[PDB]
Structure formats: structure tokens, C-alpha cells
Amino acid sequence: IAVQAVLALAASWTSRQVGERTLTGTVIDSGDGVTHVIPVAEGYVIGSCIKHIPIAGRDITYFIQQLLRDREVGIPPEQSLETAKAVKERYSYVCPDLVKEFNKYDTDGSKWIKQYTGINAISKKEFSIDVGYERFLGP
Amino acid sequence: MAYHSFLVEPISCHAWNKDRTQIAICPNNHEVHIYEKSGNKWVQVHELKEHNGQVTGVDWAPDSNRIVTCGTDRNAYVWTLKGRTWKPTLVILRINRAARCVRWAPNEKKFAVGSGSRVISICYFEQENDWWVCKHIKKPIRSTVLSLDWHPNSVLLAAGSCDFKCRIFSAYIKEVEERPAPTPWGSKMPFGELMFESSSSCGWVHGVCFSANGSRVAWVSHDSTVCLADADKKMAVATLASETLPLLAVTFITESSLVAAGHDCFPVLFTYDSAAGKLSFGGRLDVPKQSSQRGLTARERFQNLDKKASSEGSAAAGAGLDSLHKNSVSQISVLSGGKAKCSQFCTTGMDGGMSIWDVRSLESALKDLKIV
Amino acid sequence: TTALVCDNGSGLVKAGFAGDDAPRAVFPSIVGRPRHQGVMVGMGQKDSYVGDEAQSKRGILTLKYPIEHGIITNWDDMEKIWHHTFYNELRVAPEEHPTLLTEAPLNPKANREKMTQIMFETFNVPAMYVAIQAVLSLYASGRTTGIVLDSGDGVTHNVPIYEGYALPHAIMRLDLAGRDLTDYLMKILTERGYSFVTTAEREIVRDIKEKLCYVALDFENEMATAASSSSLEKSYELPDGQVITIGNERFRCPETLFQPSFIGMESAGIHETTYNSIMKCDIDIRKDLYANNVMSGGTTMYPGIADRMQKEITALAPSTMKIKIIAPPERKYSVWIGGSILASLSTFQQMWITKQEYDEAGPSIVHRKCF
Amino acid sequence: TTALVCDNGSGLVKAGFAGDDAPRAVFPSIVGRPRHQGVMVGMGQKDSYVGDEAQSKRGILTLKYPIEHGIITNWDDMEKIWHHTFYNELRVAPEEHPTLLTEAPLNPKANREKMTQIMFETFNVPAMYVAIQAVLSLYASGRTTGIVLDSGDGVTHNVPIYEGYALPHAIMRLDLAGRDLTDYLMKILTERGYSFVTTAEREIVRDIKEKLCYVALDFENEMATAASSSSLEKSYELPDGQVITIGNERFRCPETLFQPSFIGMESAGIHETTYNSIMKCDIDIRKDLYANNVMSGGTTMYPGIADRMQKEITALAPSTMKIKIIAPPERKYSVWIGGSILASLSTFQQMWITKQEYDEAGPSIVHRKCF
Amino acid sequence: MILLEVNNRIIEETLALKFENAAAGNKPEAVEVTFADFDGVLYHISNPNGDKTKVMVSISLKFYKELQAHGADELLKRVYGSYLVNPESGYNVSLLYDLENLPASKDSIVHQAGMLKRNCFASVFEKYFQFQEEGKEGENRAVIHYRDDETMYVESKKDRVTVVFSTVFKDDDDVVIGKVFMQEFKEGRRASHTAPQVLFSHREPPLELKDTDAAVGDNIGYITFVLFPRHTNASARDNTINLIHTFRDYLHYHIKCSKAYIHTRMRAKTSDFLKVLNRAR
Amino acid sequence: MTATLRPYLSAVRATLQAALCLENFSSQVVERHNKPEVEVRSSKELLLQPVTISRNEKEKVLIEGSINSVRVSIAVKQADEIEKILCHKFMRFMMMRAENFFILRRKPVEGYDISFLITNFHTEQMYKHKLVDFVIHFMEEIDKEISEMKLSVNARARIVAEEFLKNF
């Protein structure tokens, strides 16, 4: 029973071109219940300098369940979270300033203002629903 | 007679002004407040902290109002009411780790001591120190003191020890005293000298008490021997052990009868004449401050769906003991009329309450002793 | 520190905290917008007023009461009474704790999941319990075998237990407690010259009742006496300095509990009506449950009640019975106070239903977190 | 000190020690387990109420006494009751003390292994043997030789002995017990018009019967009498405060022993059926046997049956020889006391299988290729 | 829920996906497989023949030497020699599902080809069936050491088809069940009123093959399994073979499923004493 | 009933009345931090006797006492692997729950079958003799529970064909 990162060590030598030849550097790790950072030098590390980051994708996706109250409708409130992800991951990103970015979606066509379609699983029939700002606003 | 815990302190010791009004306490840990006899209510009167070694004993010289303080630091002092508060006034010693008990040479000359360090740090006042100083009985002793009693002539001393061997000693200091009167036990009476012994290494001697003039002395160990030495029977001795639960305390209440108490929480009587080894009892002394009418069926119901200790027994009528005798009783003393003519007596416990008691119902006998 | 404990139901409001001897939120369960023109500048107001504030503005107010079939129906109707209740009555964060809410059975279902969408996806609360409303009595009474009554205003229940075993065929449970008899009593005192009556005064008939009505003792002879004696008749007083007098009505409407059949209601006199469902059951219980009957809710508290009732129950029963009529003072609130005890039970805490379940679960099977 | 002697069988349990004057460990050889949703869930109850507690709770419980291919089949329900003995009757281990077990005639193959598997791997006794219960009776009488009846709550058997040498072809084992009576007996309540008649009242039926039944002295005289009288009818309390007054049934249904034919059952009536023992027996002894007719059981304590069965038997018998029929006070209760007292003949032990024999081969040391 | 299939969840879904992919003409990713089952299997799968359009399953077991000795091959030449295939090396044999070996109805073989394990066993069990049907005692027994702290053979008699066993007991806590509960089978079937003969034998293998009471008063299970023709008909047969090709292996897994379970009682119990322990107060 | 158990545990509780001793001292030559005093016993005269007490012939108790802290260990007649290792599936399970009740000398100690570590702290923590009036007897009840697991486990033996064969 190894600590989970032990598996990822193998990938760092699956990548194996010239210069892959010591254990000094820094992984940044992220996930859904956990995120991690670790000061590895040839395997050694320091307790309070390794980092155990509790902030993770659960904690985002229910916040996104509140972003539904911005724009969109017609879902069993637990197919609600399903649909929220089923949008999210292909379309969401970062902007340099909010107050520029509003106006692209306000104006400059479907490259901003995409639309998504799916099913109200209350009894498995369609909803067609907005995309826009929620892309850059999520991450 | 009567009782109350105005707040539930683990009263680990108690002490007073001689009018038994300001109750000082050994507390939980290192946090003291003195309370007072607000008629018969109990109300705070002081905060004390600067003897920081928890608290152990004291010797409140109760006329002069000088609490020589002791415990787990050499910040040991005469606390005195400076009008403002009881406040420190330092003692110098050569003990280590702690002081457990302290004991005025009865005429308040000085005090005797029981160290965290095998020893009697015989401590004497210097105006020149601005404070006390000491000299030491590291030997011929082997190990340290739990209980103390000066014989009334005040330079003559008895103690109960973790060196077990039931020994009588002298501890005269040249720079405060002169040597005592020809002590029948033994009269080599300088510093650190041994008057007499009873061969008893029989448990660590835990209580020591002169008779009403100290013509004889009692002892008990915490291993719960009960014992004596009598000089007029020509340095005679006696020993016994109790039936009942192990000792908290014992005292003479005459020259012929004594009160004892243990983990049974109720006091029991002892009685005697002068028949050397003829140590004899007199039965349980108290009657409970409770009667069977206690109950509240609603909370008994609520907390029989929940189940914490929810299968009943009269052990609970004393929070485990029965007799209202609690998690435990913790001390005993006479209030008034004394070791001859007592009018009232009192007891403490883990519950933090004052208690005072049915004395003179038991007054029902005359005279004592028989030269045997 | 503590979790809220409430008569979230009909009646008077009756709510407080776990471990209290009492509720402190106690007022009328009312929705109260105006209707008349917003005139005197300096008067300056929001739109609607709750219970005590409905009183405070009453002449101006459209006053309404959500309690259809006993169901405090619409969600919007409560939400700002709720807002008030916590933030302003109780002066409290609902987020501070789990909460001991309550329910009666025989509601339409998804109701509870819609409520929970409010109580969490509005009101966010850590957790809650929704205790079935007979249960609340058990700590209060201490009882475990017996009969549990309920009558305040706006739901009836009548529950057998024998260490539980609440009987789905032999329970009785109904749309209101003591409520629309006042319609009959209104239909009475119009006869007392009252071309002079209103909607907002059932609340005040109910007052005269609470002051001066009593449960009739020997109805036929009560009527014989009412037909022949002035001694029944006693005065009452009205807001601008006006007396009235009343006395036979004062037991006449207080017989309909034994005669819902007065209106042509299919219910017999209620303990008779009820005794029938008890007949659906074991024989052994019967003297036991007679020696174990328990009373609570507002309208249970009327004078003449037990000294009539035991003798009317006597008209039903087999021979050789002995009885216990566990009908305390404040029996009305004894049901609130029993929930306040229950909340303290460590055993009771052992599956507090969280918002965190709901956060994953959505509504879609909370009715199988239920039975 | 002790060695262990028991009525491990049907009816009540009726155990004690070796040598005692009385069985003392006594409650029904049947037990109940809640038939219910425990609606007061977490009220601190274990899943069974046992004989006397079963009865204290019988409105609550499911209960067992399995198929008439034996008395029982999941004997591993007396599983529980083994502990109910060991602790809940006794607080002791069987594993301490030499044990006198018992079993019936003609048990189908698997019995004694499946038994002893438990009795030594589980009950771990120092050493034991298993008795057959008939002559236990004669020990109490101080006898060896005669005809011994059993009729009981498990079973019946009819047992000729001669200082031993008991008849493999003229001993007559039979399934019959007071167990069986009630199936005819209780259909009569619809003749009684009682719209109210269940399973759990079978014990009250059995009660009234054990209180007031007897066997008819010459049944058509009784039938003509029931057709002309009702002093027959005798009163009986019921648990809500009712009485029922009933009592022709009280000896009508007590004909069925002569008339199994009542259910259309092709069996002869009692003494006629029994005579066949004697018919298969030696013929010479049939003189002397007139003084050797030993009769007992709980089922044997009725009035009227004695003289009836004598005259009935006498309808089969010649006169010619000196009668003694032999049925003591407390014959019902007695059998355990004779079997208890056997152990005083310490010789009775020497038969014992020890746990070693049982271990070494297995109870393949003694089971049922063994005779 | 605890049930199984002879075709594998792991395999069928992936290769039916590969054949959905073959129908689409799709390009590969790197599969190779080895794993195990009941009966001591070394499964295998591959991208054989190097290229973008083949798959091969393969298999290897030591006691194949005891099995190729028998004419199992002919039914299998029907059911699976419907397909076009060759043995791989290191494996006893292999199935090349070349994507050009796939039919129009690509699904239809998938189940069958997956169920092949037991079906290979059945392909030779049929000989003892035929021996019983031809009225033949003692015929041509399949002595196999599939296991070896255990033993088995298949054989025949005119009335009844047969298998026999051995298996060495490790722990007395097992034995105390072994020498009891099958004697409430060998003496107990009323509520399960179907079964052929099965004799678990705490010491006793039958006499033409080994001989009875060959264990330490209880320390070797020489189990035996014999069929009434209400099984040896062309039907009730199949149901039963399936159970047997897992039985004691699967059972000895169920043991541990149930070992785990008791800790519900124990969780409750131990938690109860944690409650009870307060009551000293 | 096993009635000499009454002499037995009445005499246990007479010992636990003679010698309800445990009360505190800290230091006089070495440090104030009160120890596992029963483990660290240097010398006799200050302290309780070391003792052992048979019930019969396999069964016995050990008790050992510093004046302030104490051992118990207790021995049982049972000796089959079917008695031991099976109840030791529990005595494994047991020991983390010892961390939820704080006075085990946390092992199923052999020669005995168990051990305990006891101290004066407890005498100040809540209550009086109802404590030992629970403890000493609770300790039998948790043995009577072995009978509870007995029929439980033996009925797990009655799981056997009651699954596998009874499927058919």
C-alpha cells in the first residue's frame, strides 16, 4: 500500500529523454477531493513544505450548481450537477479582465455565446440551454 | 447538621483565620481563590496565584495571620493579608522538587517542613536574609515527610515519613532557639538527633497526633496501621490496623479517644485506656444528610431512552458510595469546643461543600485511662 | 450551542430551542398584506404583516391563513414568516445548527422534498429532523404504552401505542383540530341580533370561548336548563365600550364535539367515532390503554371536558375499567416541550439528516431516506 | 455436587437436578419473536420473548413447534433455549456436570449424531447418556412391570415392560398430543357466532378447557342433555372486561379421542386402538395385567374420562380377573421426579459416553448403525 | 448479489467494442493480457500478427498434458473451429480473432467464445456421459491435477456419470464444519429436493480409484459427485456443470464474504460495550 | 447458578475494599510526573502486595499494585483453537476500542487471557463505588456474551449448505 503519488513517479520516467536523470524538481498535483505539492530532492522532503492541498473539484462543481441560478433550467436537482459538469469541462477557461470579457459575450457572437442541448431527465425529454460568460467565470 | 457547595471546588486542603471565616483552599492545579463564611453562605474574598507549585499544605498561623505556603515550587512564602490580599513573603530552603507540609514550632518560633528531597529543611528566620534560611537533616533520615506534630514545648517534634521507621527526633537551631527539656523518649536534644523509635517501618507514617497534652502520641500509616507511643508506661508503644477502607485522616479528641476516617467517607470512633497494645474502636460516628424521598421520574424516563449509568442503585445516593459520601469526602476538623468539649465539627469533599456536624449527641460517658 | 425545536404546524406558533422548558416564538400563523389606499405620508411601510403585526394593522389588512385541509400550503406564504421567525423573532441564524422540525402523516408526498429544497437550498441549514408529531408527546408524558390525543386548531391525531405499534388501520388522523365549530357558533350568535359580525372575529369568538365556553356536562338536561334558567347568562365587552350577554350558546356549540352529526358530519361524537377504530384491535390492551390515555393541543384544554368525557367513554366501554386521563395544565405546550427533551437524547442524534446528503442526493429519493 | 436432569421435552420445560423431589426449571417448551415493525425503534428489546415472557407478550410474537414428521425439526431453535436454560433459567455450564439427556422411541435416523454434535462439541459435558421416558414413571411408583401410558403435548406412547424386556412389536408409539385438539374444537366459535376467534385465543381455549372441560360419561345422554340444558354453560372472563359463557362444547369436543373420525380420519377410537398392544402381547399375562394398568400425563387430568375409558376398555375386555388401574395425584407433573431420582442408583451413569468417545471416532462411537 | 458468467465481463465488452471497431474499420491501441480464473487458468489476450487488424486470446495450464490425452477436440472443432484460429507458443492453444475472422453477425460468437472455459470441460465430460449411456463401468478415467493439495478424476458407470476428489484440510475450525454440514446434505435434502449424489468425505475416496478412510480421522476431503439420469438427460446436466466448475473455489471465497459480515454483529456488540462501559458512573 | 462466584467476587470486592488505596504523591528524589507506577515499582514498603488468585485449576487472576496504580490479568479454562482463535478474531477487533475506553493494559495477555492498567486519576474523575460495582461484574457479562457469539458463530456454521446447496 504505497502513497498515491508513488504511481506518478513511473510516468516521470516513462517520459525518459536525455536530462530525465535525477530526483530533484517539483510536482504540482490536482484532483477532485485532493490537490498536492511536494519538495522532492532525490526522494527526501520536509513535512510543513510538502503541501496537502484540500481544495478540489467537488468544491467547485456545487458552486457551479449555484451558477445555474444565473441562466438555465429544467432538470432533476441531482441530474443538475451531472449536466453542470457535462457542460463545464469542454468550454470553461480564464480571462485577463472581467470587464473586458463581459462585452464579447454581450456582443461578439456565438464564439462567445455558444448554446448546449440535452435532456430533462424528470421524464427523459429535451432541454436546449445557454452557454456564455459561465465559461470564463467557472475555473 | 448542615452542608453546601457554593461552587464545586476539588478542595484539596482547607485553612483559616482562627475565627474560621476566610476559607483558603488547595485548588485544582495552580488556581486559588479564598472564600468566606458569608453568615453561612460562601462567597469569594481573594485571588492568589504567586505560589505557583499548585498548592499542598500550609501553616496559616491563624492568630498572627501568616499562611506559610507550600507546594511544587521554592516560591514558598508566608502569605500574609497585606490588608489588600494575602500576598507572598519568601522562605529559603534546601529542599528540592516540592514542599508537601509545613508546621509552626507551636509558639510560632519557626516551622518544620516536608521536602520533595528526602529531607527536613529545618528553616529559621533571618532579618539578615530579609527572609528565612535553612539547615538540613539529609541524614540520619533516609527519606521525606508527609505529616508533622510538635510536642507542645515547641522545640520537640514528631513526624510521619516515607522513611517509614517510626522515629522521634530533635531539631534545635542555635541561631533561633535553645535545646529542649529532658525528653523521656530520649534527651540528646541538639539539631538532627534521634530520641526514640518504634521498630515499625510499618507503612509510610501518614498521621501523627499527640494526646491532649502529648504524654502519649498516636500514629497511623496510609497502609492504615493505627498505633501509639506512651511515655508514662515507660516509653511504651501500641499498634493495630483498621477493618475498613484506607485512611484519609486520624485525630485524638482526648488522651483516650480518637476520630478516624478513610475511603469509607464516614468517620469511625476509637477508644482506649492505658493497656499498652490494647488499641480499640468505637464504631461509625455519622448519620447521612439525606433521606429516601429523592427522585424525579421525568428525567429518569428521558434518560432511560438514553442509557448513561441507566440501571439504578443506592451507590448513586452517594455518587457511587451511598450515604451521600460522593466521588469522595476529602478532610475533617473540629470547629469548636475542641479535643475535650467539642460543640461542632466539620468535613470537606470533592464536591466543594462546607459541612458541619452532630457532635454532642455522643457526649454520654465519663473518665478514661488504665495503667496496663 | 443548540438546535431549534418547533411547532412548525397549525394553531398558535409554539417554538424555541432544544433543552428549553418552553417555546418563546408564540404568535398567530398569519399572512397579512393591506388593501386600503396607502394614505398618510409619515405612515411609510413594506407590503405585509405577520400575526402580531397583522393585529397591529388589522383594520387595513387582507389577513390570510395557509392551512388548507390542515396543510400550511404555499411556500411563499411561509418564507418571510420564516425569515422573521429566525432572524427577528428568535434573532437567530438557522445555519447555527441542525433543526428539529416535525410532521404529521397523510400529506401528498413531494411536498417534503419541495420543503427541503427550501430548508436547505434556500435556508442552507447544517441538518434537520422532521419528527412525526405524536412522537413529541412521549418524552413529555413519559409514556410508551397508551393513547395519544392531539387537538389544537389545524390537525387531529389519535394514536395507539403499546411500546410503539402505531396502528395504520386503527389510528384516527384528520384535516383539523378545533377550528370550524366556530362557524356553527357564528351561525348561532347572528340570532343574538348580530347583523354585526366579520371574518376577522372568529379569532375573537374563539376568545369569548376561551374565556367563557365550557364542554357541556349532560347535554339533554343542559338544554332543559338552558330552556328554563337565566343562570347560564353572563356578560362580554367590545372595543369602543360596549357590553353584550351570552350563556346557552356557551355550551350549545360546545356539544358538537359529541355531535359533528349536528352539521350532518359522518363523525359521531368523537371518542365514540374513535372507539370504533380501537375495536379493530387486541382485547388485552384495553384496560391498559384506558389506564393510559393522554391529552394535548389547544382546544383539548376546555373546562367540563374530562368529567363529561370519562362518563361518555363509560357509555362506550366494557365493564370493570379504571382510567388515567393524562391531561396536564399547558398540555397544549407539553408536546412542544417533549420535542425539546427529545432533542437532547444522544441516541436521537444518531442520524441527523444533513444538507450534505441532499447536496449529492437532490430530492429524488428523500422519501426512501424516509420509510 | 451435581449431575444434570431435565424434562428437555414438550409441554413446559420441567427440569431440576439429579435426585430432587420436583422439577423447578419450568416454562413453555415454545417461544415467540416479534411479528412487528418495532415502531418505538431503539426501545432496548432483544428479538424474543420466551415461554412465560412469550405469553406476557403473545400479541407481539411469531412462534414455532415444527412438522408432524417429528415434534420439531429446527431443534436449532431450542438453540436459543439451550442458553435460556443455561443462563436464563440457571446461570451454569453443562460442560461442568454429567448429564442425563432423553429421547423418544423410533426417532428417524439422523437424531443422535446431530444432537451429540452439539451436546459435546457445544455443551461439552464431562460424560452423558440418553434415556427413554416411560419407566421414569414406574421409578416414582417403585415398580418395573405393567402397561404404561403416555399422552402428552409432544407425543403419545403405550408401553409394556417386564423388569425390562419391553415389547418392540407391542409397545405403541403415536404422534398424538393435547397439541392437536384445538383444530376441530375452535371451528365451533362460528356456531357460537363469535365474529372474533384467533390463533392467540387458542391458549385461552386450552385455558377454559383446562379449567372446565371433562370427557362425557355416556355421550348420547350428554347430547340429549345439551339438547335440553345449559347448566353446561359456564362463565369465563376475557381481557378487555368481557365474559363469555359457554359449555356444551366442554365435553362434545372431548369425544374426538374415540372419534378421530370427526375429521373423516380413519383411526379407531382410543382404547380400541390401544388394545392391539395387548392383542400383540403375550396372552397368558392378560389375566395378571388387570392389576398393572399405569396411566399418566397432563392430558390425563380431566374428569369423566377415567370411568368412561374403564367401561370402554371393559367393552373390549372379558371380566374374569382382578382390576387395578393406576393413575396418581400429580401424574401430569410426576415423570421428571422419578427420572431425577434414578441418578441415586449411580449405576445409571456407567452407560455414559464421555466426550472422549464422541471426539475420537466422532459420535460414530454410538449414533444409529448402532442399535 | 454474488453471481458470475463463463464468458468474461472484462473480455466480451472490450472485444465486442473491438468488433464494433472492426465493423467501423478502426485503428488499434496496445492490448496484451495475461490473468487467471477458477481452475488455475493463465488467460491471455493480444494484438497478434503485429498489425492493425488482429486480436488473439491464448491459454496455458500444466495439467493440459493430462487433458490433450483425451478427445476433447471435436466438439470444440464445431463450436470454435467454426472460427479460423491457431495455437500460440507458451500457451496450450489460442483463438485468433483476426478482424478478418469476424462474421456479419459479429455478436453471435462472443458469448460462446467467452464461455469456452467450462465448455472445454464439458467437451470431455461428454465421454463419461457416453460411457454411462453405452452402459460402461470404469471407462478411461480423466485423472487430472488441476490441484494437488487436492485430487480428482472423472469416470463412468452404466446407471450414472461420476467425478471424485481429494483435498487436504488446513485448520480444525474448517474441519468442524466439513465433518458436519455435508452430513446434513448426505442426510439432508427435503428443502433442496433436487440434488444428485455429492459425498463430501472427511476421510473417504471411492474404491476403484483410491480407497475409503484415507485421511486423519477427518483431515482430507475426498469429495465425490455422481449423477442420476434426472441430471444425465440432455438438459439438467448443463445447469449443474456450471456450479461445479466454480463450486468449492467460489465457496471458499464466500467463506470470507461471510467472515467479513459478522463484524456487523461485532460492530454493534463492541460499540455496545463502549456504551455499557460508561455505566460505572 | 455458579454460586461460589459470589464468594469469589465478593472477596474480590472485599480486597477492593480493604485496599481501595490509589492516591497521589508526584516526587521526593525523582520527578513530579506521575508514572505507570505499577510498572516502575522500585521497592516494596511504600506499595501493595503482588498477588495471584485461582478460581479452580486453569482459572485465576493476577493483581499487582503500586500504592497508586495497578495491574489486573485474568485466566480462563478454555483452550481449543475453536474457543481461542475465533474469539481472537474479536480480541483483534477489541483493541482499538480499548483506545475508546482507556484502562486496558491493552493485550490478550497469555498465562492469563488479558490485562488491565488502573490508576488514581479515575478516583478523582467522576464517581465512587458504583464504578467497581459495575466493573468487576461487567467483566463477567462480557464473558456471558461469549455465549452470545457462540450461538451466533455456530449459526454461521449453519450458514453453510443453507446457502450453497439450498440454492437448488
Residue E187 contacts D where some CB pair is shorter than 8 Å: yes
Task: With CB atoms and an 8 Å threshold, state whether C363 touches A78.
Answer: yes
Distance from the Cα of F34 to chain E's closest Cα (Å) equals 24
Nearest CB to B298: which of C142, C346, C348?
C142
Which among F79, F77, F165, F73 has a CA at the least distance from the CA of F112? F73
User: How far apart are the C-alpha atoms of C202 and C179, rounded to whole Å?
Assistant: 9
Task: With CB atoms and an 8 Å threshold, state whether E281 touches B307.
Answer: no
Backbone phi, psi, residue E109, to 5°:
-80, -25
Backbone phi, psi, residue C6, to 5°:
-150, 140
Which among F156, F149, F157, F5 has a CA at the least distance from the CA of F91? F149
Distance from the Cα of D84 to chain B's closest Cα (Å) equals 22
Residue E278 contacts B where some CB pair is shorter than 8 Å: yes
* Peptide bond just before B140 cis, omega within 30 deg: yes
Residue F44 contacts B where some CB pair is shorter than 8 Å: no
Question: Which residue in chain F is spatially nearest to B114 when comparing CA positions?
Answer: F28
Q: How far is CA D240 from CA A78, B66, B355, C324, D189, in A?
A: 53, 80, 56, 16, 19
Task: With CB atoms and an 8 Å threshold, state whether E177 touches F97.
Answer: no
C217 and C202 share one domain: yes
Residue D238: CB atoms within 10 Å: 15
Task: With CB atoms and an 8 Å threshold, state whether A77 touches C364.
Answer: yes
Indicate the DSSP class of residue E233: S
Distance from the Cα of D54 to chain E's closest Cα (Å) equals 24
Q: Which of D240, D242, D243 to mutate to test the interface with C (most CBs of C within 10 A)?
A: D240
**Domain boundary residue, one of C270, C302, C323:** C270
Distance from the Cα of B308 to chain E's closest Cα (Å) equals 6
Q: How many CB pairs under 8 A join B and E?
A: 13
Task: With CB atoms and an 8 Å threshold, state whether A77 touches C359.
Answer: no
Residue F58: CB atoms within 10 Å: 11
**Chains D and F in direct contact, meaning 3 or more beta-carbon pairs closer than 8 angstroms:** yes
Domain that holds residue F122: 2-168
Domain that holds residue C152: 135-181+271-333
Q: What's the burial of B198, exposed, middle or buried (CB within 10 Å: 0-12/13-18/19+)?
A: buried
Residue D204: CB atoms within 10 Å: 17
Task: With CB atoms and an 8 Å threshold, state whether F29 touches B204.
Answer: no
Q: Residue E86 in contact with residue E96, Cβ under 8 Å? A: yes
Which triple of cell numbers denotes residue B285? 460516628
Task: With CB atoms and an 8 Å threshold, state whether F97 touches E181.
Answer: no
User: How far apart are the C-alpha atoms of E57 and E11, rounded to whole Å?
Assistant: 10
Distance from the Cα of B311 to chain C's closest Cα (Å) equals 17
D201-207, long-range: CB < 8 A, 24+ apart:
D203/D55, D203/D58, D204/D236, D204/D238, D206/D178, D206/D181, D206/D182
User: How far apart are the C-alpha atoms of B252 and B270, rounded to whole Å?
Assistant: 9
Q: How many CB pairs under 8 A join B and D?
A: 3
D130 and D21 share one domain: yes
Nearest CB to D80: which of F144, F151, F158?
F151
Task: With CB atoms and an 8 Å threshold, state whether C284 touches D240.
Answer: yes
Residue A78 contacts C where some CB pair is shorter than 8 Å: yes
Instruction: Name every chain D residue with its beta carbon within 8 A of the beta carbon of F158.
Output: 76
CATH code, domain carrying C289: 3.30.420.40
Task: With CB atoms and an 8 Å threshold, state whether C164 touches D40.
Answer: yes
Task: With CB atoms and an 8 Å threshold, state whether A78 touches C121.
Answer: no
Q: For chain B, how many helices (H) and strands (E)?
A: 2, 28
**Domain boundary residue, one of D247, D270, D293:** D270
CATH code, domain carrying B55: 2.130.10.10
Question: Which residue in chain B is spatially nearest to D43 when comparing CA positions?
Answer: B305
For chain F, what is the domain count? 1
Residue C345: CB atoms within 10 Å: 16
Encode burial over B82-110: b for 16+ CB neighbours within 10 A, e otherwise. Answer: eeeebbbbebbbbbbbbbbbbbbbeeeeb
Residue E180 contacts D where some CB pair is shorter than 8 Å: yes
Indicate the DSSP class of residue D87: I
Backbone phi, psi, residue E212, to 5°:
-65, 160
Task: With CB atoms and an 8 Å threshold, state whether C164 touches D41.
Answer: yes
D317 and D339 share one domain: no
For chain B, what is the domain count? 1
D20 and D118 share one domain: yes
For chain D, what is the domain count? 4
Instruction: Name every chain E residue with its beta carbon within 8 A of the beta carbon of D114.
Output: 184
Residue F151 contacts D where some CB pair is shorter than 8 Å: yes
Task: With CB atoms and an 8 Å threshold, state whether D42 touches B307.
Answer: no
Task: With CB atoms and an 8 Å threshold, state whether B245 touches F32.
Answer: no
* Contacting partners of chain B (3+ CB pairs under 8 A): C, D, E, F
Q: Residue E180 in contact with residue F161, Cβ under 8 Å? A: no
CATH code, domain carrying D46: 2.30.36.70
Which triple of cell numbers denotes residue D66? 415444527
Task: With CB atoms and an 8 Å threshold, state whether E187 touches D121.
Answer: no
Q: Residue C50 in contact with residue C31, Cβ under 8 Å? A: yes
User: How far apart are the C-alpha atoms of D367 and C46, rounded to whole Å?
Assistant: 93
Task: With CB atoms and an 8 Å threshold, state whether C144 touches D39.
Answer: no
Domains in chain E, start-ordered, CATH in brackets?
A: 1-131 (3.30.1460.20), 133-281 (3.30.1460.20)
Backbone phi, psi, residue B349, to 5°:
-155, 175
User: How far apart are the C-alpha atoms of C333 and C339, rounded to whole Å?
Assistant: 10
Domain that holds residue B232: 2-372
User: How far apart are the C-alpha atoms of D158 and D171, rounded to whole Å?
Assistant: 6
C320 and C176 share one domain: yes
Q: How many CB pairs under 8 A join A and C?
A: 18
Task: With CB atoms and an 8 Å threshold, state whether A80 touches C117.
Answer: no
Task: With CB atoms and an 8 Å threshold, state whether F131 touches E281.
Answer: yes
Residue F125 contacts E where some CB pair is shorter than 8 Å: no
User: How far apart are the C-alpha atoms of E235 and E241, rounded to whole Å?
Assistant: 11
Dihedral-angle region of residue E90 (phi above 0 means left; psi in -120 to 50 means alpha; beta otherwise): left
Which triple of cell numbers denotes residue B289? 444528610
Q: How many CB pairs under 8 A join B and C?
A: 17
Which triple of cell numbers denotes residue B50? 504567586
User: How far apart are the C-alpha atoms of B94 and B102, rounded to whole Å?
Assistant: 14
Measured distance between the N- and C-terminal CA atoms of chain A, rounded to whole angstroms: 33
User: How far apart are the C-alpha atoms of B3 and B40, rounded to whole Å?
Assistant: 9
Type and span of the H or E element at E241 = helix E236-244
Grid coordinates 474457543 are at which residue? F83
D100 and D17 share one domain: yes
Task: With CB atoms and an 8 Å threshold, state whether E279 touches F138.
Answer: yes
Question: Which residue in chain C is spatially nearest to A62 when comparing CA positions?
Answer: C359
Residue D359 contacts F where some CB pair is shorter than 8 Å: no
Backbone phi, psi, residue B167, to 5°:
-105, 140
Q: Which of F100, F138, F160 to mutate to test the interface with E (most CBs of E within 10 A)?
A: F160
CATH code, domain carrying C211: 3.90.640.10
Bridge partner list, F62:
F52, F73
Nearest CB to F46: which of B115, B204, B319?
B204
What does the radius of gyration of chain E's CA atoms come to, in whole angstroms? 23
Distance from the Cα of C105 to chain D's closest Cα (Å) equals 14
Strand order in E54-59's β-sheet?
E32-35, E43-46, E54-59, E93-98
Task: With CB atoms and an 8 Å threshold, state whether F154 touches D122.
Answer: yes
**Chains B and A in direct contact, meaning 3 or more beta-carbon pairs closer than 8 angstroms:** no
**DSSP helix/strand/coil, B319:** coil
The answer for residues whose C-beta is within 8 angstroms of residue E104's C-beta and 6 or more apart is none
Task: With CB atoms and an 8 Å threshold, state whether C283 touches D238.
Answer: yes
